[PDB]
Design an enzyme around this catalytic site. Structure first.
Site, mmCIF file in Angstrom:
data_model
loop_
_atom_site.group_PDB
_atom_site.id
_atom_site.type_symbol
_atom_site.label_atom_id
_atom_site.label_comp_id
_atom_site.label_asym_id
_atom_site.label_seq_id
_atom_site.Cartn_x
_atom_site.Cartn_y
_atom_site.Cartn_z
ATOM 1 N N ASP A 39 0.861 -1.194 0.000
ATOM 2 C CA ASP A 39 0.000 0.000 0.000
ATOM 3 C C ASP A 39 0.898 1.246 0.000
ATOM 4 O O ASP A 39 1.974 1.205 -0.609
ATOM 5 C CB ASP A 39 -0.927 -0.046 1.264
ATOM 6 C CG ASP A 39 -2.231 0.710 1.065
ATOM 7 O OD1 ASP A 39 -2.205 1.961 1.017
ATOM 8 O OD2 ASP A 39 -3.291 0.045 0.953
ATOM 9 N N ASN A 161 -14.092 -0.170 -5.993
ATOM 10 C CA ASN A 161 -15.145 0.785 -5.557
ATOM 11 C C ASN A 161 -15.984 1.374 -6.707
ATOM 12 O O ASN A 161 -16.333 2.552 -6.697
ATOM 13 C CB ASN A 161 -14.550 1.923 -4.745
ATOM 14 C CG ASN A 161 -13.794 1.450 -3.494
ATOM 15 O OD1 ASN A 161 -14.122 0.425 -2.882
ATOM 16 N ND2 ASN A 161 -12.783 2.240 -3.095
ATOM 17 N N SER A 224 -11.135 -1.017 0.185
ATOM 18 C CA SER A 224 -9.821 -0.940 0.874
ATOM 19 C C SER A 224 -9.906 -1.179 2.396
ATOM 20 O O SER A 224 -8.951 -1.669 2.999
ATOM 21 C CB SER A 224 -9.172 0.428 0.692
ATOM 22 O OG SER A 224 -8.659 0.573 -0.615
#
Ligand SMILES: [Ca+2]
Ligand SMILES: [Ca+2]
Length: 279
Positions: A39, A161, A224
């Site tokens: 990340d 998303n 996430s």
């Protein structure tokens, strides 16, 4: 163990029902497991990590999380207050820049890095990787995620998303990893969550409180946020000896709360991550 006034997502993970606020879990708490958070990095100095987090790799001028996203995700995996597996070891791999952005080439290199680097780490209870990231379909990105899983790491990835079928996103669409959609505190599919046959599971993803950079906290929403609930749950279950890196996604689906979620499109699993912990 019982953590009162826990974030709703932690309470949800240990409950047959929505609407409660205590997180219940075996005190083993993922001790002896390792979770890589691939990340923007992890602010390892945050008091919430208690020395259990560290940066192991960066592809940028710094290993610092200048964004906050990676710190938030790592906090949901393993922070003392906001985490599922409160005694796991967290390893940061910074494939995303401080804007939250990364080239697929870098992301792929990060996944191959974790498949090797776990051999340099002490993880007697097993190894997980959490990937709260994604873009459009890429066979090379999926291949990288499949090698990481094949290497003996439980790979958890965000479904995305886009409120769309995850088949068109990577590494979401790689069938061999654990593709995670998002739910809210009223057991609705989160409005932005991808869906589709490739999803394996849902986790809490709307209004999730966790660590942030500057030694802070905040609530944000996304697949996430769902993904590290599943990654942390996997590490927790592996420490308990209930499952293995190769089998954990299937075990979580097998033991999930079934049929609890609303607005799940026909053909998508109606399965919500659940630790089945009974005191
Ligand atoms: Ca239920
Ligand atoms: Ca899968």
């Amino acid at each position: 163990a019982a953590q009162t006034n826990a974030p709703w997502g932690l309470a949800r993970i240990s409950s047959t029902s929505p609407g409660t606020s205590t997180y219940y879990y075996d005190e083993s708490a993922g001790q002896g497991s390792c979770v890589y958070v691939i990340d923007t990095g992890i602010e390892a100095s945050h008091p919430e990590f208690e020395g259990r987090a560290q940066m192991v790799k960066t592809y940028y001028y710094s290993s610092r999380d200048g964004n906050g996203h990676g710190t938030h995700c790592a906090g949901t995996v393993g922070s003392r207050t906001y985490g599922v597996a409160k005694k796991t070891q967290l390893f940061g791999v910074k494939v995303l820049d401080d804007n939250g952005s990364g080239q697929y080439s870098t992301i792929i290199a990060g996944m191959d890095f974790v498949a090797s680097d776990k051999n340099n780490r002490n993880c007697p209870k097993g190894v997980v990787a959490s990937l709260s990231l994604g873009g459009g379909y890429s066979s090379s990105v999926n291949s990288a995620a499949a090698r990481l899983q094949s290497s003996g790491v439980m790979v958890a990835v965000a479904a995305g998303n886009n409120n769309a079928d995850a088949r068109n996103y990577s590494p979401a669409s790689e069938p061999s990893v654990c593709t995670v959609g998002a739910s809210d505190r009223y057991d609705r599919r989160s409005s932005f969550s991808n869906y589709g046959s490739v999803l394996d599971i849902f986790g809490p993803g709307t209004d999730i409180l966790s660590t942030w950079i500057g030694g802070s906290t905040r609530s944000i929403s996304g697949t996430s946020m769902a993904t590290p609930h599943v990654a942390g749950l996997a590490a927790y279950l592996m420490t308990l000896g209930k499952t293995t890196a190769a089998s954990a996604c299937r075990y979580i689906a097998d033991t999930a709360n079934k049929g609890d979620l609303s607005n799940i499109p026909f053909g998508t699993v109606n399965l919500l991550a659940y630790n089945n912990y009974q005191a």
